[PDB]
Structure 1
């Protein structure tokens, strides 16, 4: 399943990824020269695309299409800055329309002590309840804990 894990270079998405995937991590920069990775979970056979989002490519991040069906959208939770507004909305909407054919599960990262501004405000802002829509989960994490990881996958490995 082409499941796209998204976010920037510099996020430390990658850190997570291999933490999960390999057990072990790697730098807080998500990739520059991509990830395609395969994971069996629950012995079900999965492709992870991990994007160190970086702009030019970011622009092109649409860049591929076929066989799309699932989103890890990594967003950094505590990110007080790049998260919402035009960017957030735009990305979400665009993605949604383009591939209305895949569940969007957003991943909120390095929650540590959360350095956001309200779990509630944001979820709403994202129109998390614009829902009447595809399997969704809003999910909390600080990477080091991995505050919600296994469910994401688990609940996911639901059919």
Structure 2
């Protein structure tokens, strides 16, 4: 294979990024995806499997995946940890009882050999809820400050109103483009 052909292939791969969306069940993982494209969210059903959506944004082709947040669907997340350029963990801010499950899920995902090369985006969804925890409180219960081998970040959003999602996606895309290539 010639250098010219090798370069034509490197460009096509860099033009297509991969973002794996995960998080506990009923955290708005589907609502954010449906709002980021301009679809309707009132007719959303609880996902009983997984979904994929290929969109374009800022000249980048984003193939966003969305896996179920159920326990029987958590033993299969390893089936989507390949060629993942970025990870997006959704957390329910109004949920104060299951705050350790997410902290335990994110810790187990951070010690993954295949996910070491990606940008972490923490979407604290459900902010308009009266009993929703602010970004500072969530940044202390999920143990995000301790992280050092991952370019993480935490921003509060509300999928129903489509607020603060575009800045987060832009930051994620910028941090992903800051690098050159990824590992095999």
Relative to total residues, which structure has the larger helix share, 1 or 2?
A: 2
- Aligned partner of residue 104 in structure 2, secondary structure: helix
Does the aligned pair in 1 maintain the 2:19–2:88 contact within 8 Å?
A: yes
Does the aligned pair in 2 maintain the 1:12–1:28 contact within 8 Å?
A: no
RMSD of Structure 2 on Structure 1 (CA): 2.2
What is the alpha-carbon distance in structure 1 between the residues aligned to residue 93 and residue 159 of structure 2? 10
Q: Deviations over 1:81-131 (max 9, x none)?
A: 22x22x223211211121111111111111114413454333123222114
Q: CA deviation at 1:40?
A: 0.9
- Is 1:55 matched with 2:74? no
Does the aligned pair in 2 maintain the 1:39–1:46 contact within 8 Å?
A: yes
- Aligned partner of residue 25 in structure 1, secondary structure: coil
- Aligned partner of residue 57 in structure 1, secondary structure: coil
- Is 1:137 matched with 2:153? yes
Does the aligned pair in 1 maintain the 2:28–2:90 contact within 8 Å?
A: no
TM-score with structure 1 length normalisation? Answer: 0.84
For structure 1, the 5+ residue unaligned runs are none
Does the aligned pair in 2 maintain the 1:12–1:27 contact within 8 Å?
A: no
- Is 1:91 matched with 2:109? no
Count of aligned positions: 157
Q: Which residue of 1 is the match for residue 143 of structure 2?
A: 127
What is the alpha-carbon distance in structure 2 between the residues aligned to residue 116 and residue 64 of structure 1? 30
Does the aligned pair in 2 maintain the 1:9–1:29 contact within 8 Å?
A: no
What is the alpha-carbon distance in structure 2 between the residues aligned to residue 31 and residue 107 of structure 1? 19
Identify the range of structure 1 (44-53 vs 128-137) with the bigger mean alpha-carbon deviation: 128-137
Higher Cα Rg: structure 1 or 2? 2
- Aligned partner of residue 121 in structure 2, secondary structure: strand
Q: Which residue of 1 is the match for residue 62 of structure 2?
A: 46
What is the alpha-carbon distance in structure 1 between the residues aligned to residue 46 and residue 22 of structure 2? 9
- Is 1:78 matched with 2:94? yes
Identify the range of structure 1 (5-14 vs 42-51) with the bigger mean alpha-carbon deviation: 5-14
